[PDB]
Amino acid sequence: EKGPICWRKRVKSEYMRLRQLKRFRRADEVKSMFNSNRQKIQERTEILNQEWKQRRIQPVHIMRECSVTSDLDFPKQVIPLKTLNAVASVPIMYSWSPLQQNFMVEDINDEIFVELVNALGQLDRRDEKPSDKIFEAISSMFPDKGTAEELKEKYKETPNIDGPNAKSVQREQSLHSFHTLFCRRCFKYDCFLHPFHATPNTYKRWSGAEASMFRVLIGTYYDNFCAIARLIGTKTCRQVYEFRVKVYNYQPCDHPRQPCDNSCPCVIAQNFCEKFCQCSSECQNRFPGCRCKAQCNTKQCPCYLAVRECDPDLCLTCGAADHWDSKNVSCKNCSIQRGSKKHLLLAPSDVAGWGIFIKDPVQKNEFISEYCGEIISQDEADRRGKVYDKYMCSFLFNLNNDFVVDATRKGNKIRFANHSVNPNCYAKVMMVNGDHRIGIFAKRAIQTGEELFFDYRYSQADA
Amino acid sequence: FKCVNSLKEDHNQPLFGVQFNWHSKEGDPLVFATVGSNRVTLYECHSQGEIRLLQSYVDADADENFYTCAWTYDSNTSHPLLAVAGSRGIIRIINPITMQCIKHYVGHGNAINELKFHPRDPNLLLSVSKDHALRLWNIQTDTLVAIFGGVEGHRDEVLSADYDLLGEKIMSCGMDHSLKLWRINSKRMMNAIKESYDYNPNKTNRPFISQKIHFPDFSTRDIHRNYVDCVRWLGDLILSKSCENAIVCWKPGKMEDDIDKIKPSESNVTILGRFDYSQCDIWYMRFSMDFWQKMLALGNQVGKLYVWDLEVEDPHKAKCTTLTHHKCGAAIRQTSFSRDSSILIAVCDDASIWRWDRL
Amino acid sequence: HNRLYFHSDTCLPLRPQEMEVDDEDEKDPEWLREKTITQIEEFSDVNEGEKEVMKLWNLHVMKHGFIADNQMNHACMLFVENYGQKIIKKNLCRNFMLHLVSMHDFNLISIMSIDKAVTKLREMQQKL
Numbered sequence: 001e002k003g004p005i006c007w008r009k010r011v012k013s014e015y016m017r018l019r020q021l022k023r024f025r026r027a028d029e030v031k032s033m034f035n036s037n038r039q040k041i042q043e044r045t046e047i048l049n050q051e052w053k054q055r056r057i058q059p060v061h062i063m064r065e066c067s068v069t070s071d072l073d074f075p076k077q078v079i080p081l082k083t084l085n086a087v088a089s090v091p092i093m094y095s096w097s098p099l100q101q102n103f104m105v106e107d108i109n110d111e112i113f114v115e116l117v118n119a120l121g122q123l124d125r126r127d128e129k130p131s132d133k134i135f136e137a138i139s140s141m142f143p144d145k146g147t148a149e150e151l152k153e154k155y156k157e158t159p160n161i162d163g164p165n166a167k168s169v170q171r172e173q174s175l176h177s178f179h180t181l182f183c184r185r186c187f188k189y190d191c192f193l194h195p196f197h198a199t200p201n202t203y204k205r206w207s208g209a210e211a212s213m214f215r216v217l218i219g220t221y222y223d224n225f226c227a228i229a230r231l232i233g234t235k236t237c238r239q240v241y242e243f244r245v246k247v248y249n250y251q252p253c254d255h256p257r258q259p260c261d262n263s264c265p266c267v268i269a270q271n272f273c274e275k276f277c278q279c280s281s282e283c284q285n286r287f288p289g290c291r292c293k294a295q296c297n298t299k300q301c302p303c304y305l306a307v308r309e310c311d312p313d314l315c316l317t318c319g320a321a322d323h324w325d326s327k328n329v330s331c332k333n334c335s336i337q338r339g340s341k342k343h344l345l346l347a348p349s350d351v352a353g354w355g356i357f358i359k360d361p362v363q364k365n366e367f368i369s370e371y372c373g374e375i376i377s378q379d380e381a382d383r384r385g386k387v388y389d390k391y392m393c394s395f396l397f398n399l400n401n402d403f404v405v406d407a408t409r410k411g412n413k414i415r416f417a418n419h420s421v422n423p424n425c426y427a428k429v430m431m432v433n434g435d436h437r438i439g440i441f442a443k444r445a446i447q448t449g450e451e452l453f454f455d456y457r458y459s460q461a462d463a
Numbered sequence: 464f465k466c467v468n469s470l471k472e473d474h475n476q477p478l479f480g481v482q483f484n485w486h487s488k489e490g491d492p493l494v495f496a497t498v499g500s501n502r503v504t505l506y507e508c509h510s511q512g513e514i515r516l517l518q519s520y521v522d523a524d525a526d527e528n529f530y531t532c533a534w535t536y537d538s539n540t541s542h543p544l545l546a547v548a549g550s551r552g553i554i555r556i557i558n559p560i561t562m563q564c565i566k567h568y569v570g571h572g573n574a575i576n577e578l579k580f581h582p583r584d585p586n587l588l589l590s591v592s593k594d595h596a597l598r599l600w601n602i603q604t605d606t607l608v609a610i611f612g613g614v615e616g617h618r619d620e621v622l623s624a625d626y627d628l629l630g631e632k633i634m635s636c637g638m639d640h641s642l643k644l645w646r647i648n649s650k651r652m653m654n655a656i657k658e659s660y661d662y663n664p665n666k667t668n669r670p671f672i673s674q675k676i677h678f679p680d681f682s683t684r685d686i687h688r689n690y691v692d693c694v695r696w697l698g699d700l701i702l703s704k705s706c707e708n709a710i711v712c713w714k715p716g717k718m719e720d721d722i723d724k725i726k727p728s729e730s731n732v733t734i735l736g737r738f739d740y741s742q743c744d745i746w747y748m749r750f751s752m753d754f755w756q757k758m759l760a761l762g763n764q765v766g767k768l769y770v771w772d773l774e775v776e777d778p779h780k781a782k783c784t785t786l787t788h789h790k791c792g793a794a795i796r797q798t799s800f801s802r803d804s805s806i807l808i809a810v811c812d813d814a815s816i817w818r819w820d821r822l
Numbered sequence: 823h824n825r826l827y828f829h830s831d832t833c834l835p836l837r838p839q840e841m842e843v844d845d846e847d848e849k850d851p852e853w854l855r856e857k858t859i860t861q862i863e864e865f866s867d868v869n870e871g872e873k874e875v876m877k878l879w880n881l882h883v884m885k886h887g888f889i890a891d892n893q894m895n896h897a898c899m900l901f902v903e904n905y906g907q908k909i910i911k912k913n914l915c916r917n918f919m920l921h922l923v924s925m926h927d928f929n930l931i932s933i934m935s936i937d938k939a940v941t942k943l944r945e946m947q948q949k950l
């Protein structure tokens with residue numbers, strides 16, 4: 001108890017004190033470092049200047065015409081103007097990063113607050129000769145930094161298991177990081193392609209160290225504590241037993257206890273269910289695969305006909321799921337997923353700029369390369385497109401209703417293929433294990449050394 | 464400082480670059496070089512203000528426009544060497560002793576805004592480009608040691624860069640508002656440099672493998688609020704300017720953090736203070752320093768030339784003198800001290816060169 | 823075949839000794855590797871322990887470019903062979919284990935591997 005007006009003045013006074021204090025103890029740090037930095041200056045400057053002494057560099061001497069005048073009446077000078085022999089320049093190119101697959105990209109401090117609170121506190125103590133009127137006075141001089149409440153709270157103010165601080169924890173809390181940050185689709189943590197975090201159903205099918213690992217392992221092994229013993233390492237059948245007692249982009253659907261009918265996201269997006277969906281294995285909307293024995297590049301094969309590459313987990317019979325060490329396989333419909341692109345060469349175009357040339361003969365309808373770049377939203381493409389127009393020039397290509405791929409900052413060599421309305425290549429968007437990817441195909445046979453072109457207009461028409 | 468001569472080169476084009484030859488032997492006359500339009504010009508400095516015209520080259524190509532130049536030497540021959548480059552993205556090494564263009568490097572995919580030689584190794588050339596990247600060349604062995612750009616390099620044109628005194632790290636700045644630190648004393652980089660001197664094209668079927676450094680050892684967008692067009696080291700502190708009419712002194716990390724223990728994820732910067740001036744809000748205007756880094760000089764868009772004394776305590780008390788002259792009224796693009804500080808040269812939009820002497 | 827070609831990463835001219843090795847056989851381009859592990863570290867939400875396992879896995883997956891579910895068993899056996907020494911020396915043996923049980927919740931591997939892998943790891947630790 002001692003007056004609100006009084007306290008507000010103290011707030012204003014201690015704060016203004018502290019501030020002015022930090023201000024000086026900080027003007028000195030500066031002063032300190034300017035000096036002990038200038039010691040470094042002279043220290044290393046000497047080193048150079050000595051390395052300079054040990055040299056005898058030659059003086060420069062004198063030599064179509066050029067002259068220089070003086071604006072201070074000095075005599076004009078005239079000297080011979082030597083020509084530097086021409087040198088050819090290469091076309092313009094802005095910096096870019098190599099990609100072999102698409103890459104997604106999205107669209108009164110606290111230190112002082114505490115000192116002031118403490119300094120105010122010590123006045124409340126010396127008064128009697130973490131209080132409550134103090135926080136109300138501070139909220140009155142800083143109505144913004146929070147209310148009386150938030151300031152009382154702000155003032156007072158993820159396990160690891162292999163470490164010294166392991167806890168006994170839930171199993172779905174030791175596993176939490178792995179479960180949310182893991183992409184079931186491309187088998188990587190915090191992956192570069194798939195923004196929507198994993199569906200909840202997709203990851204379901206004594207010290208901290210030991211107790212936690214116990215609950216994790218029973219959720220997998222259940223009651224066979226014999227094995228839970230082998231894995232927990234330093235316990236036994238028994239001991240465990242005893243512890244027990246005490247065109248739209250594709251996105252996996254997950255609608256528990258409910259069929260894939262017309263309310264289903266996949267069905268509405270007009271997409272098939274994939275192996276990534278959490279629905280009946282008997283789902284009518286899943287795509288089967290094909291039972292081909294080879295080839296897979298004609299309307300005979302349901303995948304090719306559906307404009308999908310083959311799935312190495314459903315197409316068991318054509319070759320798509322085997323021989324991982326070769327890129328040339330029985331199946332001719334998985335060039336994108338294995339990245340079996342053709343050698344490409346970079347040189348200035350015969351039209352303009354840079355162009356791309358194929359290093360070896362390619363056959364009609366043959367895959368050449370995936371057109372790779374950043375995946376960005378239609379919104380980001382708008383932003384970026386304003387910047388790009390200044391350059392009369394752009395490398396955005398629609399992937400689907402939701403995403404554009406932009407080979408401006410990242411992509412592979414095929415982005416040097418120029419545009420033409422009489423192309424020798426075309427672009428086809430395939431569905432590939434749940435990703436839309438752009439494949440570039442030869443439109444006719446093509447010979448060694450030929451320059452590549454396709455017609456950008458068809459990409460540019462997500463009309 | 465007193466104004467002691469003013470010159471005008473016939474071509475009437477902006478002069479973007481001036482550099483004294485800090486390799487001139489003790490005793491030899493002070494030489495400096497100028498670049499602008501498609502030309503490179505050399506001058507000898509004498510007393511009572513006489514600036515003597517020594518050499519001038521013109522690019523065969525009318526559409527070349529040189530922005531920058533820099534002096535180095537040849538270890539073996541002891542010749543001075545002048546590198547120049549500009550809007551055609553091409554580096555030429557000139558041998559003023561021989562009137563030869565002896566080397567040239569095509570490669571940058573757009574214009575070259577700055578050029579810097581390594582403080583201790585004459586053969587290492589840093590070039591900074593409008594293509595968004597910098598490149599380190601080894602000009603002895605004609606090889607591209609490293610490209611500094613990529614997923615975490617500059618997102619826009621790079622305007623400037625500078626080695627620190629001993630040649631261990633590079634700092635770069637540009638139009639994306641960013642300043643970035645690139646260490647070249649890492650094992651990777653020193654290995655790449657060693658490797659570059661070994662590369663013999665005649666004894667192999669494969670090209671030299673250039674480093675692709677996509678990641679700076681530190682980057683900040685937090686010093687200036689616009690394009691950053693000049694940066695230099697003052698010690699382990701950085702001096703840098705935008706177009707907000709200040710040169711800003713700052714260091715990466717917090718006040719006590721050591722430039723060399725700073726971590727590539729460091730998000731802190733500390734602003735030590737700044738030098739104020741006016742009417743320098745057009746871009747591509749560059750401040751220069753002494754060899755002994757005792758004083759700093761900047762030129763104006765209306766022709767005023769500022770010189771500070773850096774042997775002080777603070778930017779607050781930073782002693783500033785303003786050189787000025789009825790006849791000098793153009794934008795001063797860049798300045799250059801002689802190795803010893805006796806002379807200060809400034810060059811302008813109007814093709815003019817202004818010589819200021821000391822004492 | 824009758825034209826001057828250029829390295830696509832440096833724009834320097836490609837000489838006669840030839841376009842032989844492709845400048846982009848980078849299944850895992852360098853910068854993607856560093857970019858990935860840099861992004862993991864930026865997480866203030868995840869152990870230092872479960873991160874160092876996530877990084878190693880990612881680097882491992884990126885180096886071989888697995889693309890089928892039917893490859894994950896071999897991937898985990900490959901992981902320990904190639905990375906087990908690191909997992910041990912950096913003391914990441916339990917976190918690794920949470921990785922296998924997770925990989926199992928995602929229906930990618932069998933229980934027979936989720937310990938056949940833990941077996942070969944220990945088998946390796948004693949080897950030190």
Ligand SMILES: COc1cc(C)[nH]c(=O)c1CN1CCc2c(Cl)cc([C@H](OC)C3COC3)c(Cl)c2C1=O
Pocket residue numbers: 091092093094095352353354355387388391393394395407408415416417418419
């Ligand atoms: C994909 O690259 C190709 C492709 C083909 C077929 N042919 C070529 O010559 C080049 C090279 N090239 C051309 C000139 C160019 C300009 Cl004028 C503007 C931009 C970008 O705008 C689209 C700026 C946005 O900040 C840079 C870029 Cl990214 C470039 C560029 O790299």
Ligand SMILES: [Zn+2]
Pocket residue numbers: 183185186187191192193194
């Ligand atoms: Zn993914």
Ligand SMILES: [Zn+2]
Pocket residue numbers: 253254255259260264265266267273277279
């Ligand atoms: Zn569904």
Ligand SMILES: [Zn+2]
Pocket residue numbers: 252253266272273274277278279
């Ligand atoms: Zn579905």
Ligand SMILES: [Zn+2]
Pocket residue numbers: 253260273277279280283284285286
């Ligand atoms: Zn379904």
Ligand SMILES: [Zn+2]
Pocket residue numbers: 290291292294295296297301302303304310318333
């Ligand atoms: Zn088939």
Ligand SMILES: [Zn+2]
Pocket residue numbers: 289290291296303309310311315318
């Ligand atoms: Zn199939």
Ligand SMILES: [Zn+2]
Pocket residue numbers: 292294295296310315318319320331332333
């Ligand atoms: Zn097939």
